[PDB]
Amino acid sequence: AAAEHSQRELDTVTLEDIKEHVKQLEKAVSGKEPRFVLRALRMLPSTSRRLNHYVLYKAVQGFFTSNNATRDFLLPFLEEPMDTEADLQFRPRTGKAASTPLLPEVEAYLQLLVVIFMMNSKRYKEAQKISDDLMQKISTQNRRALDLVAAKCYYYHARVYEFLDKLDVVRSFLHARLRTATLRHDADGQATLLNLLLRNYLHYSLYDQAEKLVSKSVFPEQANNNEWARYLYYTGRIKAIQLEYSEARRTMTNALRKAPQHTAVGFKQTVHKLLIVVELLLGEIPDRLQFRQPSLKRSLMPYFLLTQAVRTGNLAKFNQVLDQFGEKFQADGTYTLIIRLRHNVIKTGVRMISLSYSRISLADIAQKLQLDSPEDAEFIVAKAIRDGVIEASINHEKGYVQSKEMIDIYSTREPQLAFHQRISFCLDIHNMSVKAMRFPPK
Template sequence: MLDFTWNIVLKRFTSCTKMTVSTDVEMKNAASPSAEKEKEKKVDVDAQSIQEIKEQIKQIEKAVQTKEQRFVLRVLRSLPNTRRKLTVPVLKTLISDASLTTFLEDEMETDEPSGSSSHPATKSSAKVLPEVDAYIHLLVLVRLIDNKRYEDAVICSNKLMSKITSENRRTSDLIAAKCYFYHSRVHELTNSLDKVRSFLNARLRIATLRNDFEGQAVLINCLLRNYLHYNLYDQADKLVSKSAFPENASNNEWARFHFYLGRIKAVRLEYSTAHKNLVQALRKAPQTAAVGFRQTTQKLAVVVELLLGDIPDRQIFRQAMLRRALSPYFQLTQAVRLGELQKFNEVLKTYGNLFRTDYTFKLILRLRHNVIKTAIRSIGSSYSRITPAKIAEKLGLESPEDAEFIIAKAIRDGVIEATLDREKGYMQSKESADIYCTVEPQLAFHQRIAFCLDLHNQSVKAMRYPPKSYGKDLESAEERREREQQDLELAKEMAEEDDDGFP
């Protein structure tokens, strides 16, 4: 009986083990096709990326043959989309320079899928164009930056600059300009921007002599960013005054230039010019993309507008892409608008590190006087007569003497219309005058007209016309004479018919 039951248990155990083994095999068989599909999908995506980059290379070759820079511009505009598709198999397939493969050796084993081609596609008996070689080298540099391999990126960037400087071809100016930007960016990431300053100055001189407009614009912006990174505002201002920014530069470079110029003018107390430049930077920047640039520019624009004595529109702080970034600046605006010095100090204490990161902390410190002026203006409009001790209590000042000095300065600057009687110890406010009796409305209207005229002039300059196609539809002088002769003959015939109708 025991043997019989033991045999039954053994049979059940063996059947269960067979079932588990079979299910494991089935699970492995089911899992293997999915893994193969993922590999095939990755290979397909890489193949599609390789094909897209090959099409871009054809566009560059076409630009070299036809001397049309618009084909290269089309390729460079798609660089943000291309850099997201860069992988080791893609770059390994495109690279024709053996020295560039050393930068990809660390990632070959991890990123290269099975079945991918390891033979470079651009290797052929024909010589690769310098523009194509520089563009592929630029893609490798971008890949290194995205992977935060900054030391290798510096070496790769130096090799790229040696290639660019050794060639003297006008067809590579646009690609060289983009290479200058990433060369400066790599050294900024490694905290060595001062090492490339002399190189950028030398290339700026060469670009100016060669009328390389895009390269000149990029190099000026890189130098301004270099100077502002080390707070060298005087050198940056001298660079702006001694150089002329090319009018044919792209809108992106114009936006960067206006932003840097706005920062310089704001530090130099030229708030009106700074605000105008920042508005131009926001207008020329991409409206849907470049969110970080728009946030940084809008932060500085809010501070400059507050320094001008104006209050930014509330709608600015409600935009979806700006709401979170401008939240500290919204609290700052409320403190300035209400003239609450204590709230201003609290905001400054809470978000001081953020303001330092945004390079607006020193400008915000200047707003303390504006807060005091606003508070005194509101006090002057609310009270016809008030003592300095009461003003010191409302403003949170240490002594009535400080309030007395602040009132005297506000009266001298024209902030309030009042008189200070020190013997009796009070401030007497005057009746407020009608602002429409002053020149303020005329100045505001003139500012709006100047902005509209400037916008119209820039729109006219930005218009593009097809080259040498304006005269296709125009008739020649001989055709015009024939047409005029036919019109005369037709007029004579019509006159004769009219004469025949009336005997």
């Protein structure tokens, strides 16, 4: 059929792609440079989609095919087509190459591909077993070049079990895997393992253990930008739930900055929602461009209403906002922070008063913030002066809030500190760029 022949052609092109990736893996192991395995994994997400039964059937018929347990393991889980007319024997290894065992990296890549296909087919149980087998056989291996594919397979195994709605049978095993990766000095594998452990804790609400792990473990600096963004989001949630609001805001802004341009909509949605909540708690009204964006508009609409209520200062509006979308906030895992905002709303008003006025009288500030009595205003203002929200100094002798006089920052040292940080970053970037330089062997 026309559709069938088109599918066969796409399968053949995918087979050519996998052959190219396996050749790259072999060249990487020969040259001991991750670059090639990194590119193979980079192409992996694209190949994850656009795969049917015959695709992987032909891949297993051509690759491997040594009568090994893999063929008797995945094939019983994946159907087999009839005698295809275009029986092109996809055999990159010919004669001696076929006899030689498949390279550990290449075999791991093929097992990862089959596991991804099982994921996309919702064969949760079969992917379970195939992932255990591949993980066990990769655990024995100790080649450095295998570590990146090991990290990818680790992440996909955690994902398969996450769809298994258990995500606890993995806790100890991923802890052990991450610890071994840390011992081995691996970077990508330990990065993915730490991110996945943090994700599991955040799912099951074990915040304290996650904070302990983040405090003790150290994330390698030379990690993937996407992995860094995921870790930043997880650490931002940990900090925000733990009352380190400023650090949470900074970390989540960094995570948003490091997001993959336009590749992951959902991660951006969640980061924006949590950042909006944290910023509202910290006393800053968030930017409207986020709410106006096309992809994030409908997702953040309840947060837009919440920000409206907070800025306007109408506690009743906040209550009706919670009534309509309270369950949505809960399902988003931000209900507790929203309640904290409900009881901290006065911080935004105090911050606005601090920005506007410089010597506001206590009675007038109490009137403006709809407080009942001036003494409550004094209490709230002092609490704000600690909370990093205001920089004033109450003069209780005459009861007026005297904001600190602004000073010429340039004549002070802060510009030197900012320039030092930026110059250090620039010099480090230059050193890193000239450091690799990928000079070929003559």
